[PDB]
Design a binder for this molecule. Structure first.
Ligand SMILES: *[C@@H]1O[C@H](CO)[C@@H](O)[C@H](O)[C@H]1NC(C)=O
Ligand SMILES: *[C@@H]1O[C@H](CO)[C@@H](O)[C@H](O)[C@H]1NC(C)=O
Ligand SMILES: *[C@@H]1O[C@H](CO)[C@@H](O)[C@H](O)[C@H]1NC(C)=O
Ligand SMILES: *[C@@H]1O[C@H](CO)[C@@H](O)[C@H](O)[C@H]1NC(C)=O
Lengths: 49, 25, 143, 48, 214
């Protein structure tokens, strides 16, 4: 069921043979890469000097 | 065509284009 | 920071995934971020550089397989629906997928149409009566 | 023949002005567009 | 006497969300259109807060500055003190000895001397002066809205529309139930009251509220 696109079509159609046409098999989605957690600059500091 | 005028795509909702483009009609 | 890449962010508790492209809309000094109809986050100002970055959804869509049959031939073509696939195979991580899918998921024959992109079928300059309707005036056949 | 041709030409000419100057002549299609848009907008609003 | 009605005055920005060319329907504390506003011609009694207060005045010269706000006039709640002199505004919230004959060489500092034990003096410094301050103080946050607009003649309350962008936010942590403003030749200032209402606002392409209807 996860070897070839034609195998995916055969799985979806629940049959060993398929007819000429266009079949919607599955869906794809791009996954996130990294995390870009960002916060603003610190304008307040304790007077340690 | 000027008198009648008509987008977003979120949350797994898609719009499929028609087979016959307006030039063909 | 990353641009033109799909990434999930966190701006002062504002969580979401998307592409942080450059934008041109002008905010107001007291406004933090932006929204559109249906209450979806659209633009977020940069907390440090004071710049407005537009947010767009990450690529997604259906997959269709064009086949002329089983008794005729075992050749098929893949259509990615309403996604610009001239860039997908390199940036994304395809390590988990076996090379068996990779062979038919790339190549020198990539055709970009108005219904998505077509992989595994060549473009001819001759117009016939069409058999398999792809969309937007494009059809396919086994020749 | 000439009278009929002139009448047909005048009617064809007046058709454009009649269609363009009425803001509700083409309301049988905008109704469909608005109905579909409202349905899709209502579906998304249910996510909140 | 001399009561005045407001020509769609006292519309602020409910939130910091930026919208363009949309019609948003909101539900918040607003001042109703064509409502009664109490005009004072000198006499400055104590006025209750009652879930928000509006304030519009004509200030040619700095005369009315002290927005001293109390809570209960008892020995439990701390009365905040927003004294704004021209050099630098100071927002200090801590109780002081009330004068038996209250009042207020320009600034006299005889009001109090026991500034001790009142910590977190968090001075959050951020005809033209139509000082349209909305003093919304709800949910522990003191929000101050303002706008400076000119008029042709100082005769009555103008027409048109004017959005009220936020200017100051304060995490005071207390509430105000009765506020009385003390002065420093008639000073015309108006006092309105806020109640929950539904509004429909319109945003132009720039992002500024252009019109609204009750
Ligand atoms: C996909 O995006 C690239 C980068 O902007 C662009 O050059 C290309 O034409 C796009 N393909 C289509 C038509 O989807
Ligand atoms: C014929 O096909 C080629 C390759 O797809 C294309 O570049 C060309 O524009 C088409 N027609 C001609 C000969 O101009
Ligand atoms: C204010 O109240 C007076 C007294 O009832 C009334 O005559 C006047 O029309 C009111 N004006 C407004 C709505 O401010
Ligand atoms: C008032 O003005 C003086 C000017 O020297 C300034 O130092 C002070 O902080 C201001 N605030 C008050 C009310 O004292």
């Amino acid at each position: 069921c996860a070897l070839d696109p034609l195998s995916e079509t055969k799985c979806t159609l629940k049959s060993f043979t398929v007819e000429k046409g266009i079949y919607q098999t599955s869906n794809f989605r791009v996954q996130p890469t990294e995390s870009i957690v960002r916060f603003p600059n610190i304008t307040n500091l304790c007077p340690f000097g | 065509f000027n008198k009648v005028t008509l987008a977003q795509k979120f949350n797994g909702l898609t719009v499929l284009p028609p087979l016959l483009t307006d030039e063909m009609i | 920071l990353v641009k033109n890449k799909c990434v999930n962010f966190n701006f002062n508790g504002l969580t979401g995934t998307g592409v942080l492209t450059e934008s041109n809309k002008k905010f107001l000094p007291f406004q933090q971020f932006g929204r559109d109809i249906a209450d979806t986050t659209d633009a977020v100002r940069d907390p440090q550089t004071l710049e407005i970055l537009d947010i767009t959804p990450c690529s997604f869509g259906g997959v269709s397989v064009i086949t002329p049959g089983t008794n005729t031939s075992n050749q098929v073509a893949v259509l990615y629906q309403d996604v610009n696939c001239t860039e997908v195979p390199v940036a994304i991580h395809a390590d988990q997928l076996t090379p068996t899918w990779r062979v038919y998921s790339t190549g020198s024959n990539v055709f970009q149409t108005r219904a998505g992109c077509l992989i595994g079928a060549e473009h001819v300059n001759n117009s016939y009566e069409c058999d398999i309707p792809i969309g937007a005036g494009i059809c396919a056949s086994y020749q | 023949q000439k009278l009929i041709a002139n009448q047909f030409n005048s009617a064809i000419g007046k058709i454009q002005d009649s269609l363009s100057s009425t803001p509700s002549a083409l309301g049988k299609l905008q109704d469909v567009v608005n109905q579909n848009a409202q349905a899709l907008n209502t579906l998304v609003k249910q996510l909140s | 006497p001399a009561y005045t009605n407001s020509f769609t005055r006292g519309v602020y920005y409910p939130d910091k969300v930026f919208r363009s060319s949309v019609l948003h329907s909101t539900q918040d504390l607003f001042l109703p259109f064509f409502s009664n506003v109490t005009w004072f011609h000198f006499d400055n009694p104590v006025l209750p807060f009652n879930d928000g207060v509006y304030f519009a005045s004509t200030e040619k010269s700095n005369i009315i500055r002290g927005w001293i706000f109390g809570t209960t006039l008892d020995s439990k709640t701390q009365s905040l003190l927003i004294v704004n002199n021209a050099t630098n505004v100071v927002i200090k919230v801590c109780e002081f000895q009330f004068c038996n004959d209250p009042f207020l060489m320009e600034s006299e500092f005889r009001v109090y001397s026991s500034a001790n034990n009142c910590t977190f003096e968090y001075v959050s410094q951020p005809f033209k002066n139509l000082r349209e301050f909305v003093f919304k103080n709800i949910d522990g946050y003191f929000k101050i809205y303002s706008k400076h607009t000119p008029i042709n003649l100082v005769r009555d309350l103008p027409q048109g529309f004017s959005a009220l962008e936020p200017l100051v936010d304060l995490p005071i942590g207390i509430n105000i139930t009765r506020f009385q403003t003390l002065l420093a030749g008639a000073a015309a200032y108006y006092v309105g009251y806020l109640q929950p209402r539904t509004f429909l606002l319109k945003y132009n392409e720039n992002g500024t509220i252009t019109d609204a209807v009750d």
